[PDB]
Amino acid sequence: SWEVGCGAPVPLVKCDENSPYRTITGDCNNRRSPALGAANRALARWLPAEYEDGLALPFGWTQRKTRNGFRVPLAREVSNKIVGYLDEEGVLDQNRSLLFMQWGQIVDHDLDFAPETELGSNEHSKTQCEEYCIQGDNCFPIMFPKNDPKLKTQGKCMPFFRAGFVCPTPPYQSLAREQINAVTSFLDASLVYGSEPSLASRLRNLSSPLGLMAVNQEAWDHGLAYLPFNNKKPSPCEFINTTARVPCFLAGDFRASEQILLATAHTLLLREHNRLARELKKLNPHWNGEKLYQEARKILGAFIQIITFRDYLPIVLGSEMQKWIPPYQGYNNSVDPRISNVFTFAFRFGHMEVPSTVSRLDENYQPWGPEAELPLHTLFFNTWRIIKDGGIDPLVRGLLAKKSKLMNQDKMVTSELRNKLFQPTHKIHGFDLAAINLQRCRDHGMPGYNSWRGFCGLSQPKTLKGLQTVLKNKILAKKLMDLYKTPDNIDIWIGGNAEPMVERGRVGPLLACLLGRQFQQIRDGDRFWWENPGVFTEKQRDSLQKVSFSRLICDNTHITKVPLHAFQANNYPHDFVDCSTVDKLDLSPWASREN
Numbered sequence: 001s002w003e004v005g006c007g008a009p010v011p012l013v014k015c016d017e018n019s020p021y022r023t024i025t026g027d028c029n030n031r032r033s034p035a036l037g038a039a040n041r042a043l044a045r046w047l048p049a050e051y052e053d054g055l056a057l058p059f060g061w062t063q064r065k066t067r068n069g070f071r072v073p074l075a076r077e078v079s080n081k082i083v084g085y086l087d088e089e090g091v092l093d094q095n096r097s098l099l100f101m102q103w104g105q106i107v108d109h110d111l112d113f114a115p116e117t118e119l120g121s122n123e124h125s126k127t128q129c130e131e132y133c134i135q136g137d138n139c140f141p142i143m144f145p146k147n148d149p150k151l152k153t154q155g156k157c158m159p160f161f162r163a164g165f166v167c168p169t170p171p172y173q174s175l176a177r178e179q180i181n182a183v184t185s186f187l188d189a190s191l192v193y194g195s196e197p198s199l200a201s202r203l204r205n206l207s208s209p210l211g212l213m214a215v216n217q218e219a220w221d222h223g224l225a226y227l228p229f230n231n232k233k234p235s236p237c238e239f240i241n242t243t244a245r246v247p248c249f250l251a252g253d254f255r256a257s258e259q260i261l262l263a264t265a266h267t268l269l270l271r272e273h274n275r276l277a278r279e280l281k282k283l284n285p286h287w288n289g290e291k292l293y294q295e296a297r298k299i300l301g302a303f304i305q306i307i308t309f310r311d312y313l314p315i316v317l318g319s320e321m322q323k324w325i326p327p328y329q330g331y332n333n334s335v336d337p338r339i340s341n342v343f344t345f346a347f348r349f350g351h352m353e354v355p356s357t358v359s360r361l362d363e364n365y366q367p368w369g370p371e372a373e374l375p376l377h378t379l380f381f382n383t384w385r386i387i388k389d390g391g392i393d394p395l396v397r398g399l400l401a402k403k404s405k406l407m408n409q410d411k412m413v414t415s416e417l418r419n420k421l422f423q424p425t426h427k428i429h430g431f432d433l434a435a436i437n438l439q440r441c442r443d444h445g446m447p448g449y450n451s452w453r454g455f456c457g458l459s460q461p462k463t464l465k466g467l468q469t470v471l472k473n474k475i476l477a478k479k480l481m482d483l484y485k486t487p488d489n490i491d492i493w494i495g496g497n498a499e500p501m502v503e504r505g506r507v508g509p510l511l512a513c514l515l516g517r518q519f520q521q522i523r524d525g526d527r528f529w530w531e532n533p534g535v536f537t538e539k540q541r542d543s544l545q546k547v548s549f550s551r552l553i554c555d556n557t558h559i560t561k562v563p564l565h566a567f568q569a570n571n572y573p574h575d576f577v578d579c580s581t582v583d584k585l586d587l588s589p590w591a592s593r594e595n
């Protein structure tokens with residue numbers, strides 16, 4: 001009847017109350033409700049889901065059924081008319097390095113993943129949805145509007161499969177459909193260690209009692225470790241280049257090889273675990289492998305939290321940072337730490353920060369070889385350009401010395417993502433991440449733009465002129481009104497990203513509120529927050545305050561010249577220092593004395 005808890009899956013609650021370490025699943029963090037923030041449960045609903053039929057059909061599903069009296073426009077038509085641009089000149093962020101973009105993706109992948117339903121195992125609709133563009137069950141194809149050039153070269157649609165949902169994926173559940181978060185809601189390095197026990201063990205080196213993560217046994221980066229290969233088929237990293245046949249990496253997170261700089265960041269974090277585990281073994285030779293793994297895992301989780309909340313979030317939220325994330329006042333076990341469904345769309349502001357090219361730079365921060373700069377689309381599921389072209393150092397120098405794309409109301413998403421995206425099992429560099437995001441907002445039953453404005457205490461524009469004023473842009477407001485016909489129908493991904501950025505920040509007021517609230521909750525609601533008294537000793541916390549992405553690079557690469565503020569736009573050599581001058585993480589406070 002009430003159906004308070006639909007929890008047939010993952011019923012197991014076997015909580016050690018005493019454990020100084022996190023579970024891999026996120027279970028037991030909250031003592032009163034131990035499933036809160038656990039992986040493989042429903043995304044939180046801050047507002048009730050909004051479906052065409054009130055339960056699970058997306059707006060746009062039934063041609064005849066309006067939203068508030070108007071047909072919702074095709075995701076791809078919004079993408080073409082609003083999100084696309086031609087000229088990559090002038091589009092770079094003069095005050096954010098490319099590392100700023102890349103850290104956002106890292107944090108996002110630690111916090112949330114809504115994987116497509118697996119109803120494609122030995123299924124026709126796996127290829128049939130792509131082949132015949134026929135909407136049904138989990139097939140919700142992105143149809144091309146009539147004037148779309150892709151209609152001329154790529155057929156009628158782009159394939160799209162509905163996200164997985166809680167209480168059996170194929171059939172009906174208690175009231176509205178709730179999509180799954182497959183990773184831990186805590187900011188806990190689940191993207192390095194995994195959110196499931198099987199994966200987390202596969203990633204470990206259990207051959208030695210050294211608490212190490214498994215490393216590649218077939219390839220080395222000038223003696224430095226690579227992630228292991230994912231030896232499974234079919235492999236998109238092999239598909240791109242069947243001559244090189246270099247597989248995807250195997251990381252804590254499914255998505256680690258989606259692009260070369262994400263793979264690069266994952267590689268830095270793995271190196272850091274093993275570095276930490278080796279340093280701890282020197283300090284504490286009596287520590288067994290499990291203890292070394294847990295202790296290094298706990299430090300790397302703290303590293304990710306401190307970089308995120310001290311360095312990253314202030315330059316995302318700008319003037320809104322203090323409003324939404326006041327200085328820390330300790331653990332609040334009444335806070336809901338779960339990632340919300342809306343946050344998983346709010347955080348996609350990163351899509352508008354991705355620039356059109358990636359560079360490899362040499363030890364003078366000068367172009368590395370004759371093709372030093374490459375188009376982003378050639379680097380989707382690309383591991384062979386790492387193994388076979390110079391390792392991660394040239395790409396890390398690019399992350400430091402090159403710039404994020406700046407979000408621009410006239411230039412939102414580069415064609416490298418908007419027309420050339422590669423999706424596994426599709427075979428073409430032909431997808432549109434903007435269209436996918438809009439279709440997914442509808443898949444997840446998102447409330448529209450004005451419902452979220454109301455949620456955030458902001459004005460709800462009802463007319464062209466009101467929207468013009470909110471967006472500070474008359475042409476953008478007119479295009480959105482021509483497509484939507486009411487600001488109430490504007491999908492949250494495009495409405496949030498259309499707002500001009502807050503002072504000293506990189507998102508508008510609506511996104512600052514949605515992101516701000518989520519990050520407040522993941523900090524306040526986390527029993528294992530690095531700064532929660534008892535988690536670390538006061539001396540440990542004194543050491544941890546000195547972490548920086550600059551030291552992470554110095555410690556885990558052959559790079560000896562780094563900037564002191566790695567998320568800022570930094571130019572070589574003026575903004576760069578020797579690793580010598582950069583604070584180290586002093587692990588002496590981890591020395592464990594019994595006798």
Ligand code: HEM
Binds near residue numbers: 101102103112440
């Ligand atoms: C080249 C860089 C990137 C690529 C190729 C990429 C690709 C993708 C793809 C294909 C999806 C899945 C879309 C769907 O099926 O609904 C996605 C989701 C997402 N992306 Fe990106 N992305 C990039 C950068 C970023 C950045 C920089 C951020 C944040 C700052 C970000 C945040 C997200 C979030 C939060 C999701 C939803 C995750 C989930 O809950 O399932 N991405 N991205």
Ligand SMILES: *[C@@H]1O[C@H](CO)[C@@H](O[C@@H]2O[C@H](CO)[C@@H](O)[C@H](O)[C@H]2NC(C)=O)[C@H](O)[C@H]1NC(C)=O
Binds near residue numbers: 205208216
């Ligand atoms: C697991 O860790 C062991 C212990 O370090 C690794 O084996 C060593 O392998 C390296 C080759 O990369 C050799 O240089 C050393 O001589 C070996 N040392 C010892 C003490 O055996 C093993 O490669 C690791 N396995 C994985 C999958 O990472």
Ligand SMILES: *[C@@H]1O[C@H](CO)[C@@H](O[C@@H]2O[C@H](CO)[C@@H](O)[C@H](O)[C@H]2NC(C)=O)[C@H](O)[C@H]1NC(C)=O
Binds near residue numbers: 240242384
């Ligand atoms: C597939 O990967 C191979 C293997 O690296 C790439 O070949 C390199 O190709 C260029 C020629 O354009 C040479 O100058 C390099 O020295 C090659 N190395 C080797 C070992 O062959 C090839 O370019 C890739 N093709 C695609 C489609 O990505």
Ligand SMILES: *[C@@H]1O[C@H](CO)[C@@H](O)[C@H](O)[C@H]1NC(C)=O
Binds near residue numbers: 335336
């Ligand atoms: C604990 O969280 C609850 C619910 O979010 C909040 O209302 C309360 O004020 C919080 N406690 C403190 C001390 O901020």
Ligand SMILES: [Ca+2]
Binds near residue numbers: 186189
């Ligand atoms: Ca996590």
Ligand SMILES: [Zn+2]
Binds near residue numbers: 222558
């Ligand atoms: Zn080297």
